[PDB]
């Protein structure tokens, strides 16, 4: 599993369940090409987005649909989404965990990179 | 001043100085159009981005060039940029402050909306 | 002003107003002794906690009464308080700003040290 | 496992390994009584701190030794430690995950509470 996403809810103190996550890869013409997508599980985790064969080097954008998450909870979301952008595999293959902590007017994200 | 941006460095415990900040507004065709830009001051603040007349309701993206900031300090960064995408709604007098806290492998962003 | 505290609310996107803040300094016997205290203003800021003469090097603890803040808003909080424990060292002219971002089940705290 | 602690390093983009974590429980005389302690693993996780039988209701303080962590990495730590304080099991037994993200001048913490 080369790319995992974990999402937590800072208002309820819970995993953020059934949150849509879209991954794009920067194309040669500087446009964002669809790469992978999924929904977080009951643990707030999204495994199986991609495979080692598909996950090449490049610039990736992980978009987390925070707006739908907050709307479903009847909360006024400020952010449309989170947009985590990073270069992956530039020195060779790595495993990446993108973690995000969500509040209506704030978000924090970190990455755990393992060789 | 309807839109202010403040950037802090969590490694050095200091304002993030001379950081490029680009603001985009979502156009009718779903593309991101340039709206305002500047560089943070010695206090890590960016004032005078826009005016009350120009800052209408809409979907905005604030992109902070964190990659150049870390590279100039000789610290290896993970992200290309730190950001906030949000909806600006007129619900009485409002001033938006977008604050970002930077670390090489993480960032936090919050919005303070005041009257 | 050698020590300032700023508190923000990540649920409402606003300053956290009238929040009690207590500052302690580590005594010789390893106990926490009261040092300064106050309440945040309408801007979520607390100025005038101490003076240059009183603020010596040492280990300080800033305790923010987040539990009372959330209870007054009718939101169930997790933490008793949000905090920062740090060492204050004189390395040229220094001003400390302790900023805290609050959510019911999370908080972030940072220190900005300036000249 | 009723109480788990997970610690991440925002500078290196890694789990914070071999970080000391001390848990105290507030005693009848308002003093902090030792309750459990351990070190984070290679995954930055600390499992097996306590048992369901030992983990009664009360006010708990989770102290993370951030100072030793940063000193071992040759980084100038601002914080002495992190001090996460919360009431546990007041409505009946719950499982708690305390997560912390560390930077030299900042820290973020969240709690995941499951029934
Ligand atoms: Mg390459
Ligand atoms: Mg409108
Ligand atoms: Mg000294
Ligand atoms: Mg009870």
Author numbering:
A (entry chain A), B (entry chain B), C (entry chain B), D (entry chain A): 10 to 124
From the paper:
Transthyretin (TTR)3 is a 55-kDa protein that aggregates into amyloid fibrils under pathological conditions. In its native tetrameric conformation, TTR transports retinol-binding protein and thyroxine (T4) in the blood and cerebrospinal fluid. Amyloid aggregation of TTR occurs by dissociation of tetrameric TTR into monomers; these partially unfold into amyloidogenic intermediates and self-associate into soluble oligomers and amyloid aggregates. Here we identify two segments of TTR that drive protein aggregation by self-association and formation of steric zipper spines of amyloid fibrils.
